Scaffold this active site. Structure first.
Site, PDB file in Angstrom:
ATOM      1  N   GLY A 162     -87.535  27.287 -75.465  1.00  0.00           N
ATOM      2  CA  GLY A 162     -87.647  27.873 -76.805  1.00  0.00           C
ATOM      3  C   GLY A 162     -87.836  29.351 -76.719  1.00  0.00           C
ATOM      4  CG  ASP A 163     -89.955  33.253 -75.785  1.00  0.00           C
ATOM      5  OD1 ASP A 163     -88.955  33.944 -76.085  1.00  0.00           O
ATOM      6  OD2 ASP A 163     -91.073  33.720 -75.436  1.00  0.00           O
TER       7      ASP A 163
END
Length: 282
Positions: A184-185
């Site tokens: 997600g990052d």
């Protein structure tokens, strides 16, 4: 307070040298970065529920068997200190600089380091992960668009707004995919590398805060944004993920607005200004 938190650490972990120890604070958490070990100290009774959350996420991600290190809980969560604390392993290595990642003699190795992790993430047992991790919400981009219009649209030129509406639309237009583990990052700062007999090895991934059951295109977008089209094309070719390109670009078109909205919501003026540059000529 930190001499108390240091008092807690020395009491529980007598071996740990706090001289020249990293320190990262906030409204939420104090973190002592020792040599081999990180100590997270919540600040309020509310933020203390993070500790079992961090354990559960890291345990579930570890159980996927990515083939690379992730932070390990080295202790149980403890009710020491004001609101408890958690000891995690520290991973060694450094982010790959874009120029190092993309040299012709390493770019194939780098692409395969990303591919083997992404493949293991895409192949995770999502029925198991869904009992522990968050799941991507089908409405997520509609909500984000509302907040960008409420918070950022007033600060934009008209051309800025037209550009933002197109980027927000490409994201809202994606059908919902929740088939894999998503970091997600997965920008370069979160991915740690070592020279292993003169070639790069992806040794660890940190900062699993946004981890979820989601769309594998979202992490490919982040790799692309950190390292450029030459690297991500090789990763996509190796994964056979050529069908994902429209989704990859839809994620990437949102990254500056994501940065700007975070800047505003977090009081980081540099992130707000940097995120908005394409959205105002003034």
């Amino acid at each position: 307070t930190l001499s108390h938190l240091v008092d807690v650490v020395r009491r529980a972990h007598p071996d740990v040298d706090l001289e020249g120890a990293g320190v990262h604070s906030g409204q939420f958490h104090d973190v002592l970065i020792a040599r081999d070990r990180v100590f997270r100290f919540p600040k309020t009774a509310g933020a203390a529920a993070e500790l079992p959350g961090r354990v559960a996420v890291l345990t579930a991600v570890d159980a996927v068997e990515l083939g690379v290190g992730v932070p390990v809980p080295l202790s149980e969560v403890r009710d020491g200190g004001p609101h408890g604390f958690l000891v995690l392993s520290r991973l060694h290595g450094t982010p790959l600089e874009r120029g190092d990642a993309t040299s012709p003699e390493v770019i194939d190795v780098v692409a395969a380091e990303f591919a083997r992790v992404l493949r293991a993430m895409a192949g995770a047992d999502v029925e198991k992960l869904r009992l522990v991790l968050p799941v991507a919400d089908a409405g997520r981009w509609r909500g984000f668009a509302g907040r960008v219009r409420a918070t950022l649209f007033p600060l934009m030129s008209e051309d800025g707004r037209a550009r933002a509406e197109r980027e927000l639309a490409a994201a809202v237009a994606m059908d919902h995919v929740a088939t894999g583990l998503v970091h997600g990052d997965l920008g370069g700062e979160n991915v740690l590398w070592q020279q292993v007999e003169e070639l790069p090895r992806l040794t660890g991934i940190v900062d699993w805060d946004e981890a979820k059951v989601g769309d594998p295109a979202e992490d490919l977008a982040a790799v692309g944004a950190s390292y450029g089209p030459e690297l991500v094309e090789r990763v996509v070719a190796l994964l056979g993920a050529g069908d994902l390109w429209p989704r990859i670009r839809a994620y990437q078109g949102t990254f500056a607005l994501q940065q700007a909205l975070a800047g505003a919501e977090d009081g980081d003026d540099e992130e707000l200004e940097d995120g908005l540059t394409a959205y105002r000529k003034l």
